[PDB]
């Protein structure tokens, strides 16, 4: 399946993901296209932050769903 990740600027990127993929894998998929380290990025779905441990199937992410991407660089 494919899902859509929506940045804060309003830009939308599409990702070829399988339900068995972990959130960790998703942030790596984002890293492939955007070039940002998976630890400086965080994903939001259903008003909650997604943890790298669980998979999409655990979070009920389905085909053509929308995730929100927020970036925060380490301030020390």
């Amino acid at each position: 399946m494919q899902i859509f990740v929506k940045t804060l600027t309003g830009r939308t990127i599409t990702l070829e993901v399988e339900p068995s993929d972990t959130i960790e894998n998703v942030k790596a998929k984002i890293q492939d296209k955007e070039g940002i380290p998976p630890d400086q990025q965080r994903l939001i779905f259903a008003g909650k932050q997604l943890e790298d441990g669980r998979t999409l199937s655990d979070y009920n992410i389905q085909k053509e769903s929308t995730l929100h991407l927020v970036l925060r660089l380490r301030g020390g």
Binding site: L8, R42, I44, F45, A46, G47, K48, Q49, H68, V70, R72
Partner: peptide, 28 residues
């Protein structure tokens, strides 16, 4: 009665004047 931010979906606590996630401001 958690409020959701305008710029990201994240629902925050009523006491928070700013979202914890994208550091946006409280909506009018």
């Amino acid at each position: 009665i958690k409020w959701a931010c305008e710029y990201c979906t994240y629902e925050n606590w009523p006491s928070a004047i700013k979202c914890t996630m994208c550091r946006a401001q409280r909506p009018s």
